[PDB]
């Protein structure tokens, strides 16, 4: 799903719950709050552990 034209607070997404498998690959996870992103995508699904 495409996400566009909005403000994305990293902290609130990061501190919502203790995500079991959480890792950001190409970037250090913290500084999203300062960054700008062009056409981020979200890949939603369900998998087993």
């Amino acid at each position: 799903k495409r996400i566009s034209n909005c403000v994305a607070d990293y902290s609130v997404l990061y501190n919502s719950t203790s995500f079991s498998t959480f890792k950001c690959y190409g970037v250090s996870a913290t500084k999203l709050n300062d960054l700008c992103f062009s056409n981020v995508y979200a890949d939603s699904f369900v998998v087993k552990g």
């Binding site: 190409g26 970037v27 250090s28 500084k31």
Partner: protein, 49 residues
């Protein structure tokens, strides 16, 4: 041959400046992003290259 010397140093400087704008096995050719897009523990891994 007089203009040859200046032409030679011209290519020299041109290549010297030009080849920086090139990743060397790096995600990007520009340092300040790699510094600002990853943390030191693996940012070092790229800046060393």
């Amino acid at each position: 041959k007089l203009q040859d010397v200046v032409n030679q140093n011209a290519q020299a400087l041109n290549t010297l400046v030009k080849q920086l704008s090139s990743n060397f096995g790096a995600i990007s050719s520009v340092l300040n992003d790699i510094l600002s897009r990853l943390d030191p523990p693996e940012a070092e891994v790229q800046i060393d290259r």
